[PDB]
Symmetry: C3
Subunit: 253 residues, 3 copies
């Protein structure tokens, strides 16, 4: 029997909003340490990893490890039925056909109970990338979302350049080009540059990642020459939601 009670149910609400536009189906890995989810988007240039530690929950019981195949569009629909202050309890039997979600209103005349059907998913084992930390940018999550939104008007790809304690985002298209330069100062921008890095990413996928913005005031960019970019959002006390993105490749000279 798996049962987990989360007092701030909005966390779960926001997590599904941040996943659903990116991936349809995913396998939720449940165990004694908590909830873990890993999946790629359909064209496999992008990976998502979610961690919710058992201690972040107000109640946590996991008798046996589960892998729940979940239609995320379905689960998103159910979670839109929970209010922002609701207490949410997940519950599942030992070889799970269905996942139960219970929503309790903050003052208690109202209780909702949903039964979500689980699906069958092919799981292909994914290497989570080795992390090199060549440059690390911590900044406000809104500002990062706004940068990505802005440069989408200019072009479809952003060049991220990290150099001696400044970072620059660049784009170009038929109307012209632009760039946004951030310098070092919950309003703080911090740039930590161990080796300079310059890479090109698809704005389409960065704009999906920023659907996670409501989970945190700050976002961390981890960029390295040799690895996918990491975009990370800390979730409360519980864990994180991390997005990995391969650099766009390049033309040949």
């Amino acid at each position: 029997m798996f049962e987990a009670r989360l007092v701030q149910g909005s966390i779960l609400k926001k997590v599904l909003e941040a996943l659903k536009d990116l991936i349809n189906e995913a396998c939720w890995d449940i165990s004694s340490s908590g909830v873990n989810l890993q999946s790629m988007d359909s064209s496999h240039v992008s990976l998502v990893q979610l961690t919710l530690r058992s201690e972040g929950f107000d109640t946590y019981r996991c008798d046996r490890n589960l892998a729940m195949g979940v239609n995320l569009t379905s689960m998103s629909k159910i979670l839109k039925c929970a209010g922002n202050e609701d207490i949410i309890t997940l519950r599942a039997e030992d070889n799970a056909d269905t996942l139960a979600l219970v929503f309790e209103a903050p003052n208690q005349e109202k209780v909702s109970d949903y039964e979500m059907k689980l699906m069958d998913l092919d799981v292909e084992q994914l290497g989570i990338p080795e992390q090199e930390y060549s440059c690390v940018v911590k900044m406000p999550s809104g500002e990062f979302a706004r940068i990505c939104r802005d440069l989408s008007h200019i072009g479809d790809a952003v060049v991220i350049s990290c150099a001696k304690d400044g970072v620059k985002f660049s784009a170009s298209g038929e109307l012209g080009n632009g760039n946004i330069k951030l310098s070092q100062t919950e309003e703080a921008v911090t740039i930590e540059m161990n080796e300079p890095v310059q890479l090109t990413f698809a704005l389409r996928y960065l704009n999906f990642f920023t659907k996670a913005t409501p989970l945190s005031s700050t976002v961390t960019l981890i960029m390295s020459a040799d690895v996918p970019l990491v975009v990370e959002y800390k979730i409360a006390d519980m864990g994180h939601l991390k997005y990995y993105l391969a650099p766009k490749i390049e033309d040949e000279e």
Copy 2:
């Protein structure tokens, strides 16, 4: 001549917002006791009845009885031109070919005057259904709107079960199922339940979600359920009347 002055004009604004989705053309029955409207909705599934009592207007004069054919979409468009604080006056001569709507801003330096062409309608003649009151639920209208919108993500129909202390709303569909249980409350945030005989009834969420467009008219909604007669979903308008929606529990 018919003339009615209504100080809270936002009432008519809200009434038209609540009807315009549901109904294209309808007849407004004007009499000295007030304004009455009865229609099947445009898909001929649910029945709508509107009541505005003459007492609720600041000024009311009706010389002879009118039946006004109204395009509600037109009337809706005209009423979007009224401010929420406007005093609205309705006026029609007895050869009733146009309806006039006068909007006075409260600072008396703006006045709008619209003349709506009336329509010639072949009105379906309708009785209002027998009401049986097996079960009556009063609840916050927003909560009821929220419940219907939610469940419509799950399934196409809600099953309403009622017992003495509590009411349950259920739906089910391909993705799974759900239910929302409301307990009776210890003023307009209360859920009160009068259960005279138990009831378990199924209704189309699509039609319920049209009904809840009347939510702006009242902070509470009343559900009147019976096994043998149409469900009544009812919104009290100020002190002057009601907007009621009817939906059959069976095809019978």
Copy 3:
């Protein structure tokens, strides 16, 4: 080098918001006196005149006079990238193929920089109708916008009537007709020197009111033998004026 620094960047955001649906491409004339723009709209029905005086800028430099061909759609998209509190700087070389737009945020650690290609424009000159002031109406810009939006549901044209009484807006159409009567009073001012009654296309008025964010008030200047003038005062820097000939 042309260079102009504007502390309230929102002024340019709003000005492009107000022009971009009306005009696809237009000519920006740069002088020592300031920025000037004159264009017919896409359909060659109304005339737009924009004036931003050099005095209004925190920094202004014009070495040689410029006429910059500008795609308003492109310049609009770029100004979507400035924050409302951003400080905006315009820069061009003297034979300018590109215009630069620099956005500095209030927290002084973000700076954005944009280069727009300039259009090769066959630049008209039109001439500005001289104004008679038979009637002048001053009212809240919001009220005026709501009047034109409202009357659009009724009909495609509005009849504007001015008497010392007040001003009346009328429209007539398939579903019926309506009028709105304003009287002298967030104030409504009516200078009526000579009575005017004229008919305008609501399509164009609903475009003009895209300028509403620029001012809490709009001025209508009406006269029998000239275009209607719809004017929005910009800060203290200048105005955005729209001109529309009546229907016959």
